[PDB]
Amino acid sequence: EIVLTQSPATLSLSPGERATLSCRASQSVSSYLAWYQQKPGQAPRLLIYDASNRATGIPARFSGSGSGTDFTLTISSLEPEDFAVYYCQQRSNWPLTFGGGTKVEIKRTVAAPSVFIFPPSDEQLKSGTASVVCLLNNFYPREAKVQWKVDNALQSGNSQESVTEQDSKDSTYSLSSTLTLSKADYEKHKVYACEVTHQGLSSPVTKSFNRGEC
Amino acid sequence: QVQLVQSGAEMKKPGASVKVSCKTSGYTFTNYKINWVRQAPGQGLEWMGWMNPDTDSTGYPQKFQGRVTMTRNTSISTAYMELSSLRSEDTAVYYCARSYGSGSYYRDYYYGMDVWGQGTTVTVSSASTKGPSVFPLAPCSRSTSTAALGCLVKDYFPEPVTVSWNSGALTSGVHTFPAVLQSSGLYSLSSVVTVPSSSLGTKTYTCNVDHKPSNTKVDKRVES
Ligand SMILES: [Cl-]
Ligand SMILES: [Cl-]
Ligand SMILES: [Cl-]
Numbered sequence: 550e551i552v553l554t555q556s557p558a559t560l561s562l563s564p565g566e567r568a569t570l571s572c573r574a575s576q577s578v579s580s581y582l583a584w585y586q587q588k589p590g591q592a593p594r595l596l597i598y599d600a601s602n603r604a605t606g607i608p609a610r611f612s613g614s615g616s617g618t619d620f621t622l623t624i625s626s627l628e629p630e631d632f633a634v635y636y637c638q639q640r641s642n643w644p645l646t647f648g649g650g651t652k653v654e655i656k657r658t659v660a661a662p663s664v665f666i667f668p669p670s671d672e673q674l675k676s677g678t679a680s681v682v683c684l685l686n687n688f689y690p691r692e693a694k695v696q697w698k699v700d701n702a703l704q705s706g707n708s709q710e711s712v713t714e715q716d717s718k719d720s721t722y723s724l725s726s727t728l729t730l731s732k733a734d735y736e737k738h739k740v741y742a743c744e745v746t747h748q749g750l751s752s753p754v755t756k757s758f759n760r761g762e763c
Numbered sequence: 764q765v766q767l768v769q770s771g772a773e774m775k776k777p778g779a780s781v782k783v784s785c786k787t788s789g790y791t792f793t794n795y796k797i798n799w800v801r802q803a804p805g806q807g808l809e810w811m812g813w814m815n816p817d818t819d820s821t822g823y824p825q826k827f828q829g830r831v832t833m834t835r836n837t838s839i840s841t842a843y844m845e846l847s848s849l850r851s852e853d854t855a856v857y858y859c860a861r862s863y864g865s866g867s868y869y870r871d872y873y874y875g876m877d878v879w880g881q882g883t884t885v886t887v888s889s890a891s892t893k894g895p896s897v898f899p900l901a902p903c904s905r906s907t908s909t910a911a912l913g914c915l916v917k918d919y920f921p922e923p924v925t926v927s928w929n930s931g932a933l934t935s936g937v938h939t940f941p942a943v944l945q946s947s948g949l950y951s952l953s954s955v956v957t958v959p960s961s962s963l964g965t966k967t968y969t970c971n972v973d974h975k976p977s978n979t980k981v982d983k984r985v986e987s
Contacts (some may be wrong), residue, residue: 583875585808592858592879593800593808599873599899636808640872644824647808663957665911667900669852683899684911684955686938709943724942725953727915763903 551575551639553648561652562654570651572637578619584613584622587650588633589714590712595634597622598692609712616688627653630717630738637663655720660751662688662724666756668763679735682758683743685714685724697728698757700738735760764779764788767859774886774921774976784882792840793817796862798876799833799844801855811857814842815864843963849887856882875891877908886921890948895919897970899985900953912985913955914970915977915982918945919977926954946974 552575562568580600585593596606597613601619612626624631632655637648662685669679683686685693691712697704710726726743742757770784785797799811812823823834831882832845840858892929900913916924926939933956942952954970972981 550806564818581872582808585875591874592860592882594879595875595877598875604875604877624971638808638875644826645810646871647810647827651805663909663911665902668903670898670901673896673898673915679899680915682913682915684913686893686911686955686957709945710937711941711943713938713940720840723938723940723955725938726866727943757901 553637555648555651560653563656564627564679566627570635570695570714571620574618578617578639578641582620582636585636596650597703629738657689657720659749660689662747664745664756681728687721689721691722695726696744698742698750702738765878769880769883772884773850779884782845783857785842785880787840795864797842797987798860800833800858803855822896851887853887856884890920892977893920894974894979897972897981897983908960909957910960911957915952915953916972918949919974920949921976925973
């Protein structure tokens with residue numbers, strides 16, 4: 550089956566700049582190539598069919614080119630509505646395959662995160678589990694290290710995290726991390742800390758609290 | 764005017780099957796192909812096959828042979844896709860999408876998938892319906908800036924969960940995070956708000972958590 554490769558997977562650009570997206574096919578697909586756009590929580594939308602024809606109602610700043618093996622989708626000047634994921638789809642040979650998607654995201658000035666830490670509640674301790682939350686708020690770019698320390702001991706693989714989409718107003722990201730311990734484990738230690746590393750601070754920032762000394 | 768309307772979210776045990784329907788209107792049902800395309804959380808897109816309502820023809824990638832069935836009822840313009848022998852890796856959003864019908868010079872590949880249904884989240888898990896418990900996220904004291912508080916919505920199934928603050932009146936500063944899947948098969952998420960310190964002891968902050976699949980709503984007070 551034909552494999553389609555999209556480069557790069559991630560693109561950071563400002564509104565107004567041009568966007569150039571690449572689709573490479575493992576074997577030739579002639580001109581049977583389509584592009585779709587997708588925003589979070591929404592069905593994909595057709596932009597280009599047969600490599601270079603704009604779909605009905607698609608605005609002129611999108612156009613695609615190429616044939617056989619190498620394809621480009623060009624967004625000539627980027628509007629806020631154009632930051633989404635783009636997929637290519639080959640339509641010559643079964644099964645119709647899609648590429649992995651390129652995510653077009655908004656570039657802005659580096660912004661350091663504000664860090665907050667939350668102990669597990671007394672409510673939650675009655676169950677025999679403790680969840681400790683760390684919050685990184687309003688940072689850019691997306692890359693950040695969060696490190697869990699319990700009495701100086703690094704905790705690896707007993708925490709999960711997630712990250713918001715780029716923020717509506719200021720194009721920032723936010724991150725939530727949950728360290729979960731049994732009640733027995735939690736009650737047996739005293740210091741809990743959250744160390745975060747980010748481009749926007751020339752020094753690794755730590756927020757901690759003392760169990761029962763809150 | 765053209766719409767594809769698919770049926771509601773489903774949850775299923777591994778081994779069972781799922782049938783998703785797609786009601787079309789605004790056009791001659793019998794003149795366009797219907798496609799089914801799925802997308803797993805965080806992942807890309809996978810074509811599952813198509814059908815021509817006009818002739819009742821079907822075609823599926825080898826991947827899905829024996830597992831997918833597509834059928835139609837012309838009288839009510841609705842397409843159906845059934846997937847059997849579900850495994851937890853079949854957890855995805857399933858879309859129907861329409862494409863131009865037969866065919867003059869492969870025009871059915873010439874054009875793409877132009878109108879799409881809104882999607883149907885199918886969840887395959889051995890977990891069972893369970894409402895969440897909501898725990899407060901509060902700082903350790905009132906520090907010596909701006910502050911942050913929150914709700915931890917732990918241990919529910921299935922998705923989704925909605926969270927507002929002070930009955931919807933508090934909007935600026937809210938981040939509600941994507942749910943994580945825990946190894947116990949239950950979901951968990953947090954929701955936070957950044958407020959200026961000077962206001963902490965002066966107003967109440969409640970979060971409002973709704974989980975419609977278990978029919979539970981919880982208003983939870985947060986304070987330090
Ligand atoms: Cl637009
Ligand atoms: Cl102690
Ligand atoms: Cl029939």
